[PDB]
Amino acid sequence: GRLPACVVDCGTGYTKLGYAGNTEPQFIIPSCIAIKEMKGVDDLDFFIGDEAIEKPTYATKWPIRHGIVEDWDLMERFMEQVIFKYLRAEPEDHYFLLTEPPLNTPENREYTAEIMFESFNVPGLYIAVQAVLALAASWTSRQVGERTLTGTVIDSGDGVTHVIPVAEGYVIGSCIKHIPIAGRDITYFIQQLLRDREVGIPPEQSLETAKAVKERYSYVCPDLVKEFNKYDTDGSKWIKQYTGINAISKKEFSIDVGYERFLGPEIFFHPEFANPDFTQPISEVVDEVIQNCPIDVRRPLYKNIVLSGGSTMFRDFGRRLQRDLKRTVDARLKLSEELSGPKPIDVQVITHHMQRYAVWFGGSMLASTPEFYQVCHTKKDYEEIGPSICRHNPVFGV
Amino acid sequence: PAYHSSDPDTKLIGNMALRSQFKGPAPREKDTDIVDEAIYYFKANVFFKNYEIKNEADRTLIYITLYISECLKKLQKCNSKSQGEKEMYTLGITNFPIPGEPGFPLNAIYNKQEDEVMRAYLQQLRQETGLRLCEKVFDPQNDKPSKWWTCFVKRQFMNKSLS
Amino acid sequence: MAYHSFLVEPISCHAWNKDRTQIAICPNNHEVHIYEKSGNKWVQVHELKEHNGQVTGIDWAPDSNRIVTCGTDRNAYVWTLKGRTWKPTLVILRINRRCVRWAPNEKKFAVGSGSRVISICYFEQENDWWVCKHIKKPIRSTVLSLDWHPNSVLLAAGSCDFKCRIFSAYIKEVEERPAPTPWGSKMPFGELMFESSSSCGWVHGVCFSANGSRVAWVSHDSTVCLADADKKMAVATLASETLPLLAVTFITESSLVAAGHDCFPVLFTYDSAAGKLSFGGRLDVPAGLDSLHKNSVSQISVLSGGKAKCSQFCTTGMDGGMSIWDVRSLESALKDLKI
Amino acid sequence: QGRKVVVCDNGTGFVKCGYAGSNFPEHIFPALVGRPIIRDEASELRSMLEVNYPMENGIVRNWDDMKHLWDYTFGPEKLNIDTRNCKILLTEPPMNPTKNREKIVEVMFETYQFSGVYVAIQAVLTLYAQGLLTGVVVDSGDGVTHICPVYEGFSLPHLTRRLDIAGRDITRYLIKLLLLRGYAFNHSADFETVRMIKEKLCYVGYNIEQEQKLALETTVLVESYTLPDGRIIKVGGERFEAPEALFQPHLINVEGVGVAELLFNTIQAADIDTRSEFYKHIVLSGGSTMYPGLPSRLERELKQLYLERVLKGDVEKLSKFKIRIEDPPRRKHMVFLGGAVLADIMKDKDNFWMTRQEYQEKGVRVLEK
Numbered sequence A: 001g002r003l004p005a006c007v008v009d010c011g012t013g014y015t016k017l018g019y020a021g022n023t024e025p026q027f028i029i030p031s032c033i034a035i036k037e038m039k040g041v042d043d044l045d046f047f048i049g050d051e052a053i054e055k056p057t058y059a060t061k062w063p064i065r066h067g068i069v070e071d072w073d074l075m076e077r078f079m080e081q082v083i084f085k086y087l088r089a090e091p092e093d094h095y096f097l098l099t100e101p102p103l104n105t106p107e108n109r110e111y112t113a114e115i116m117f118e119s120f121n122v123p124g125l126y127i128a129v130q131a132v133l134a135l136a137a138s139w140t141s142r143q144v145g146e147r148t149l150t151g152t153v154i155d156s157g158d159g160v161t162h163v164i165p166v167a168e169g170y171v172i173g174s175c176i177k178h179i180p181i182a183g184r185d186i187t188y189f190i191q192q193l194l195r196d197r198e199v200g201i202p203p204e205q206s207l208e209t210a211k212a213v214k215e216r217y218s219y220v221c222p223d224l225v226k227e228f229n230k231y232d233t234d235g236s237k238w239i240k241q242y243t244g245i246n247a248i249s250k251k252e253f254s255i256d257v258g259y260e261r262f263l264g265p266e267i268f269f270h271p272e273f274a275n276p277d278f279t280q281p282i283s284e285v286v287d288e289v290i291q292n293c294p295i296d297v298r299r300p301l302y303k304n305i306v307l308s309g310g311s312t313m314f315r316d317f318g319r320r321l322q323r324d325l326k327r328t329v330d331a332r333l334k335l336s337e338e339l340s341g342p343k344p345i346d347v348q349v350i351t352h353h354m355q356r357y358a359v360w361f362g363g364s365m366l367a368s369t370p371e372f373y374q375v376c377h378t379k380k381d382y383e384e385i386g387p388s389i390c391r392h393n394p395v396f397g398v
Numbered sequence B: 001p002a003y004h005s006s007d008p009d010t011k012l013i014g015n016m017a018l019r020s021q022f023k024g025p026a027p028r029e030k031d032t033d034i035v036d037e038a039i040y041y042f043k044a045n046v047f048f049k050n051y052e053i054k055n056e057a058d059r060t061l062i063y064i065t066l067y068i069s070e071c072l073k074k075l076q077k078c079n080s081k082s083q084g085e086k087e088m089y090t091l092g093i094t095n096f097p098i099p100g101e102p103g104f105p106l107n108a109i110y111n112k113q114e115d116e117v118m119r120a121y122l123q124q125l126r127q128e129t130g131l132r133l134c135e136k137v138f139d140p141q142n143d144k145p146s147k148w149w150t151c152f153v154k155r156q157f158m159n160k161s162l163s
Numbered sequence C: 001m002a003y004h005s006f007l008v009e010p011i012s013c014h015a016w017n018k019d020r021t022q023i024a025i026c027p028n029n030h031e032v033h034i035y036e037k038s039g040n041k042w043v044q045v046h047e048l049k050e051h052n053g054q055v056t057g058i059d060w061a062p063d064s065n066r067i068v069t070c071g072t073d074r075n076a077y078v079w080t081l082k083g084r085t086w087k088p089t090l091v092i093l094r095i096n097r098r099c100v101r102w103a104p105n106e107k108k109f110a111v112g113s114g115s116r117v118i119s120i121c122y123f124e125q126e127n128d129w130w131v132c133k134h135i136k137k138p139i140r141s142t143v144l145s146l147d148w149h150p151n152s153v154l155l156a157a158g159s160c161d162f163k164c165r166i167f168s169a170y171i172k173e174v175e176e177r178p179a180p181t182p183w184g185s186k187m188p189f190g191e192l193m194f195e196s197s198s199s200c201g202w203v204h205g206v207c208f209s210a211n212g213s214r215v216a217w218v219s220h221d222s223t224v225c226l227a228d229a230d231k232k233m234a235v236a237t238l239a240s241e242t243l244p245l246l247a248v249t250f251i252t253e254s255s256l257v258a259a260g261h262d263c264f265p266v267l268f269t270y271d272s273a274a275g276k277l278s279f280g281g282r283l284d285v286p287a288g289l290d291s292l293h294k295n296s297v298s299q300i301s302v303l304s305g306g307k308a309k310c311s312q313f314c315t316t317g318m319d320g321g322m323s324i325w326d327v328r329s330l331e332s333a334l335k336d337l338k339i
Numbered sequence D: 001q002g003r004k005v006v007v008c009d010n011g012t013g014f015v016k017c018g019y020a021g022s023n024f025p026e027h028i029f030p031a032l033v034g035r036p037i038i039r040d041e042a043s044e045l046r047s048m049l050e051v052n053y054p055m056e057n058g059i060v061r062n063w064d065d066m067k068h069l070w071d072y073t074f075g076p077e078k079l080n081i082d083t084r085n086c087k088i089l090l091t092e093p094p095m096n097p098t099k100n101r102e103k104i105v106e107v108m109f110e111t112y113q114f115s116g117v118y119v120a121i122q123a124v125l126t127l128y129a130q131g132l133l134t135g136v137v138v139d140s141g142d143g144v145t146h147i148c149p150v151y152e153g154f155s156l157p158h159l160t161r162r163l164d165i166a167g168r169d170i171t172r173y174l175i176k177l178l179l180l181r182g183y184a185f186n187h188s189a190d191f192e193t194v195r196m197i198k199e200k201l202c203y204v205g206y207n208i209e210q211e212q213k214l215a216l217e218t219t220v221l222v223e224s225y226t227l228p229d230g231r232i233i234k235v236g237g238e239r240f241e242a243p244e245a246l247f248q249p250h251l252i253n254v255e256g257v258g259v260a261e262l263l264f265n266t267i268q269a270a271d272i273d274t275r276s277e278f279y280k281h282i283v284l285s286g287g288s289t290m291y292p293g294l295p296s297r298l299e300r301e302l303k304q305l306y307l308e309r310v311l312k313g314d315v316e317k318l319s320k321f322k323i324r325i326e327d328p329p330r331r332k333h334m335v336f337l338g339g340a341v342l343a344d345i346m347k348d349k350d351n352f353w354m355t356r357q358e359y360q361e362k363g364v365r366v367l368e369k
């Protein structure tokens, strides 16, 4: 009505919270909560966000595993501190739009509804799909010409990278494919590479340093021969230097960043590098996902390829993706046209401006519309009918 | 995908026969060579585990690479360029692996004269690889082995090894 | 005292072969399994997946070597052995709605069901097809347990109508006439020859004697009632302190054994002198259960010996255990048990 | 002697062919012509194949597909027999156009050049297996649920009604219903999957109020089921509410009163000397007649509509009304067996069957009807 609702997307590696309508998140915290190693207000002594990553008197726990919730009570306390300590907004005087995973169970949605409605007494509640809002965030790259709920969305994060086909707001579970290489695995690959390449780095800061390498200098290349020959022949303009501070001695520690910057980002285009139990490249995964779905919507899925999540913000990822996809596509088209005794298959990998946090952007764009007040399940309907009132979320905005 | 090897009338010995000063069953060698070609894509295929055979030359490239792995693993403890060259001669003189003998980890993939020619070509190839790598491995500063080349000391190509 | 762990779920029906060489059973499934005995261990040999629901009744004609089965599939299957495969034949039951047993004549079978009509069925060789005539006179509920008499012309059945009636399913086109019985002279298809006086409890159990003189039944009012036509159709009931019995069969002409919700096979003897039933006691004396089966008994057939002198009693229950009993070992164990 | 007679039922979605006399069908294949676009034989591969149906709602749309369908039905896959040296018997749907019936024999005499042909009414053939002359044959397949009234071997075309709710519509109802329950399925990708789930756990309840009560209150109607992807869903009341559209066609936005209301309004709309006869003999044949609990609901609603309108409140005068419907055990394909019986009976009976010479001499409409 007069005030604004709150939006909160809980990811595996990072939780994004803020107010709907805003340009960016009001607080983008870490997906971890502090706990004790019980009666009274023992549950009130809970710290969440970045202020829990390195607690020493408490224990740092992780709740959101691979997009799905593992321990409910912990996530409850986390949402508590997210509501009161981080947002500090009146819950009874505000609505809320929560995000779900691609493989979110119905019973899980029911439980989330219970925790949000019974304990918080929220005036509004809406459980949305990630890819649904993602395609909408991708509809904020292309203006008004082609803003549709049809397309194939690939959401890569710290926990799990997935390829989910979306059609008119309705996802096709039978076509959805799961990928093994996630942001944490690329970060880990960088950690091992840096562990094998140079020394003089404290073990208590190794992982963070690796993450830094994945953040600042990491970039995906086109070929695996030239990115190494340019480092072997030149190596004066390519090889970068990284300087950090050892938290232990407060001294300036230094390392050399090079081939790893290409390798880590290359781990997606080739999963065979760091996984013996995975041989499929992302191109093949997307191809099979588009092919194992309805044929009538296949062209639309191949047309609107939307990148969502943080692990897809790496440079020139979608370029190589679209390259391989269009390559295989043109190849198959030629093979089909050689034995034909076919129209041009258009393929486009979209790169949104907020492709890092698209799941939350789409939610903020959905919650800003008047329809979100009509679509969101009311507290009244929740108390009158039951939890089943939050079991099916309507899709509008088209 | 993975990398492969780039004549119509070319002699062959067994399942796999393509410029060095070491004696062997090797023919005269153009500007680029099989050793140079193998050294070109050495740092890349090492991380790759899966690979497909497209030409007989690919087997030779795989052999040169698998030899380069042990060569670098031995060059890891080098302290001088001359020491690296000598160790290269020692590696070239070594004979511990053979096609379908006591385990080449790829005996499923790959006469007396043929065996002799194969062994001679193997010694010549190993010597050529060691000699060629011995110069590029050491840096101009402090005559020591470079870390950017000793980085692939732990990684194994095609999840197999000669040692 | 020989219990064999076959499955974890309950058992529906227990059937045996002619020479008792093979045993057939269903595990509350859309299919029926047939297992044999090769040494100390048992192994499955045949499997029939013709029925389209949970199998309720199954009986094997010994001399005919042919097993008929009928359950929730609202159909009957007169299965006969064809070479190395048991071929089933769909015998139309003609019912708009849990029991089956071949006659001693092994020519026609009674199918008592929830259609409140004991559907007798004979095989017409003129049309090469099975026909099922339905006896529904004086029937108000389903036919829990159905057992024949030695006459093979008069059938007995307990109903959910709190009574165990003994009617006649005699088809005069499949056999010769029936001799005069002590249960009456007028024997016609559909004619009610006998009935119970109980107004409480369901008659889950019902079985006639070997002499055909007495017909007994077990009611779900924790009471068992045996009737004797030798004393002008006298009815003798008895209340058991234990729970209700589910299956009832006679071991001797004056000694019957039965189990049920009590989950323990019990023995009893009825003195013809005084004209009353007496309790023999617990023949099954030893999870947390004080008996072999961890649930209620569901069926109890005879292995060998007849209903006058059973040498071995076969017991199937809801425990998933095949309970093989012997009268000799039971008499050698309980010395205070008079048969 | 008659060079092997046969019987073929070419329905909307499922084609069932069998030899004459067979108590069942000797081959049952899905009716779909499949084509490739890249460089039960077709149903296996449908995710990457363009599938088309020749027989739409009973009628043939694409003859170019129907011809190949016939060549695949008489091919070496299911029948494996020469059309020029064997007779056949086809099944037709009620209220069919004369043009369709003519074109059928025309294509069966010219394209296939069969030496023998014998068409019959499916509404008549369905009762023929039951051995009756007067009865109500109600067919509910994948195309449409047509209710046909038969009497003395004939069907009144002015008495044959039809409800636009079929097995396909049951599938769509189940797939739509599951979506609201919390799960998610595709409209085209998991079509057959949803059809299977419905065929498995779904049903039709007698007391909608009491069934809704048992579903909402108790947790006994809820059953679980595993999908192809490995994941499992638990469906409860959706099992019955999905098929309930068969009784009340207002639950799927359709014009009509319901199969029970249609049958009842078509029963009282008959001769008063035949009203007590047609209400005691109703044959249930069709794929949608295998739903566990349809018979009881039909009997109950039929009892309602002849006690609120025929008895008009008179309770005592309700018992006199006869009520007997027979849900045969082989009701799943009574049309086929009924043919398999007829074709076995009139195998060599006189000469009451269309001949090739009579189709080559004169009269493509040589039909004694």
Ligand SMILES: Nc1ncnc2c1ncn2[C@@H]1O[C@H](COP(=O)(O)OP(=O)(O)OP(=O)(O)O)[C@@H](O)[C@H]1O
Binding pocket: A010, A011, A012, A013, A014, A015, A031, A066, A067, A155, A156, A157, A158, A159, A160, A182, A183, A184, A187, A214, A215, A216, A308, A309, A310, A311, A312, A313, A314, A356
């Ligand atoms: N600047 C960057 N460029 C590329 N990748 C990054 C960058 N910063 C962080 N990442 C990677 O992105 C991952 C987190 O991505 P994201 O926020 O999409 O996942 P999430 O939403 O926290 O979890 P989920 O995807 O399960 O919901 C981290 O593992 C990190 O390694």
Ligand SMILES: Nc1ncnc2c1ncn2[C@@H]1O[C@H](COP(=O)(O)OP(=O)(O)OP(=O)(O)O)[C@@H](O)[C@H]1O
Binding pocket: D010, D011, D012, D013, D014, D057, D058, D139, D140, D141, D142, D143, D144, D166, D167, D168, D170, D171, D195, D199, D286, D287, D288, D289, D290, D291, D292, D332, D333
């Ligand atoms: N056990 C079942 N319960 C309910 N419906 C079923 C069952 N099995 C199959 N069906 C439905 O029956 C339909 C097909 O039935 P059937 O083959 O008898 O008719 P048809 O010949 O395909 O149609 P038509 O005769 O109208 O051309 C399918 O759509 C399917 O959904």
Ligand SMILES: [Ca+2]
Binding pocket: A011, A012, A130, A155, A157, A309, A359
């Ligand atoms: Ca996410």
Ligand SMILES: [Ca+2]
Binding pocket: D011, D141, D286, D335
């Ligand atoms: Ca049909």
